């Protein structure tokens, strides 16, 4: 979908623009993509950027008729020096697959249940392990803790919707109960690829003050948590202003 | 002049590829960026291998890598050769190093090049069926490969493609009645076994 | 170049000047079924004649 990719590019640019004006600047040279994409740890915002890309632009006129297929790209967002950045869509398996994998995995489990019955044994957890994350209901659920309870939950979907009506805030993933469904996606790998793709820890820190705190040793630094003041100050009767 | 221990520059390269692969929606965009680099004829082999290894990190087959390959081949033949080579690599030498999963990614993955003729077909023939020398790995690899390619062509168009294929190391009509039990039986095991007929007749003929 | 919203390859780019091109009926006249694509019609034609 063209226009959606269009909106991505806009929106994300708009957010970065927020943090920018948050100081005073739109200047691009001040904010190299390190600033926005280094994970929180290294002291970046850690925002997960799938704007970048390159966006298929082909000759609208006919694309109101034929479906002319991609002939050109238009640069989505930019850089100054480039590098590149990995984008989410690449770390998330597409539905078709997961339905197919589900199909097979649950077949395997059909058999191994029939054996472990026939042999009157209880499951290996290994025999099942390789497939731990595969499957749409995500085999893991079988062995989740509170199952004896959750048998008596019914119609969780509907409820997860009609919550629309019954309360103010969203819970933007309505379409799943991590209890019933397992958990349908992981990321982490992203962190690693963004870390290096920015040029590795040793360049990323060339942007900071990390050689001004005199630490010669990096990884030993945890940051610290500004947890304390809010509990101390927030509750106390601070002026609304 | 130096006796060289390590290639570190070439691990740099290895990165930049893998990276370009992990940016990019679609698949036909990755094709572009790569082709934009203008890689030298030396490395147009190794680049390919990188791709495939990423494919094997990836938890399941994905149309992406396939459409990437295709739109890369139809740009130039040097890529064509590079692939056929890598098929030799994987199947012959390098299957030994793969777990029974990643064959699930391959079998299909070549399935899509071979159904649609980017491979082309007969380069299969290099593959052989013998208890003599075949890896139970390789057994599985090929197994999948057909259970994919079938699921496109539908076992009839495949009747054609085979009948004009002349695959021998796979299909002798001329000898090894034993190895015809091993072949044809093994295609009762895969389950398709409806392109194994004429060889079945031959079984009946030798005696 | 401006007034048509085109760009000579080495040329200065400007704004549309007649921005709403997007209104269109679905109408058979210039359709594809009925046209011959033989030579592409690059811009410079459109700025030349």
């Amino acid at each position: 979908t063209e226009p959606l990719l269009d909106i991505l590019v806009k929106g994300e640019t708009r957010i970065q623009n927020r943090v920018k004006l948050g100081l005073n600047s739109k200047m691009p040279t001040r904010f190299p993509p390190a600033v926005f994409y280094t994970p929180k740890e290294l002291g970046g915002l850690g925002m997960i950027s799938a704007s970048h890309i390159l966006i298929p632009a082909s000759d609208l006129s006919w694309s109101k008729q034929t479906d002319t297929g991609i002939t050109h790209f238009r640069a989505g967002m930019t850089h100054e020096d480039e590098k590149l950045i990995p984008t989410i869509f690449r770390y998330i398996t597409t539905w078709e697959n997961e339905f197919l994998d589900s199909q097979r995995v649950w077949a395997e489990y059909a058999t191994k249940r029939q054996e472990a019955i026939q042999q009157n044994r209880r499951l290996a957890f290994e025999e099942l392990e390789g497939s731990w994350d595969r499957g749409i209901p995500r085999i893991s659920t079988l062995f989740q803790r509170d199952r004896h309870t959750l048998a008596y939950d019914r119609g969780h979907r509907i409820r997860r919707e009609f919550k629309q009506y019954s309360l103010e805030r969203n819970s933007p993933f309505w379409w799943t109960n991590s209890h019933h469904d397992g958990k349908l996606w992981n990321l982490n790998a992203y962190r690693t690829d963004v870390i290096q793709a920015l040029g590795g820890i040793e360049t990323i820190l060339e942007h900071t003050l990390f050689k001004g705190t005199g630490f010669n040793s990096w990884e030993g630094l945890f940051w610290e948590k500004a947890s304390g003041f809010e509990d101390s100050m927030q509750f106390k009767k601070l002026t609304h202003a | 002049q130096i006796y060289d221990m390590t290639s570190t520059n070439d691990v740099e390269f290895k990165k930049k590829i893998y990276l370009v692969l992990k940016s990019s929606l679609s698949g036909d965009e990755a094709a572009h960026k790569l082709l934009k680099l203008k890689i030298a004829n030396n490395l147009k082999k190794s680049v390919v291998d990188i791709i495939i290894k990423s494919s094997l990190q990836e938890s399941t087959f994905s149309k992406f890598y396939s459409i990437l390959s295709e739109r890369m081949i139809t740009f130039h033949r040097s890529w064509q050769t590079a692939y056929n080579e890598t098929f030799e690599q994987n199947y012959t030498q390098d299957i030994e190093d793969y777990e029974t999963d990643q064959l699930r990614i391959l079998g299909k993955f070549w399935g899509h090049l071979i159904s649609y003729e980017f491979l082309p077909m007969d380069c299969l023939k290099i593959i052989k069926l013998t208890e003599e020398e075949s890896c139970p790995q390789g057994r599985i690899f090929i197994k999948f490969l057909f259970q994919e390619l079938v699921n496109e062509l539908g076992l009839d168009e495949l009747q054609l493609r085979l009948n004009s294929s002349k695959l021998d190391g796979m299909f002798p009509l001329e000898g090894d009645a034993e190895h015809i039990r091993y072949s044809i039986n093994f295609f009762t095991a895969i389950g398709l076994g409806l392109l194994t007929e004429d060889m079945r007749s031959r079984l009946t003929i030798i005696q | 170049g401006k007034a048509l919203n085109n760009a000579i390859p080495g040329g200065p780019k400007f704004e549309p000047l007649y921005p709403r091109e997007e209104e269109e009926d679905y109408n058979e006249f210039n359709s594809i079924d009925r046209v011959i694509f033989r030579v592409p019609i690059r811009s410079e034609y459109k700025v030349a004649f």
Partner: peptide, 27 residues
């Protein structure tokens, strides 16, 4: 040779407006 591919203008569109030929799809 802006041939109809590309944008009316990059003023609002947040991109640079850069358009390049796609190496991939030719035949």
């Amino acid at each position: 040779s802006y041939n109809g591919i590309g944008l009316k203008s990059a003023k609002g569109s947040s991109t640079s407006g850069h358009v390049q030929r796609s190496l991939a799809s030719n035949n």
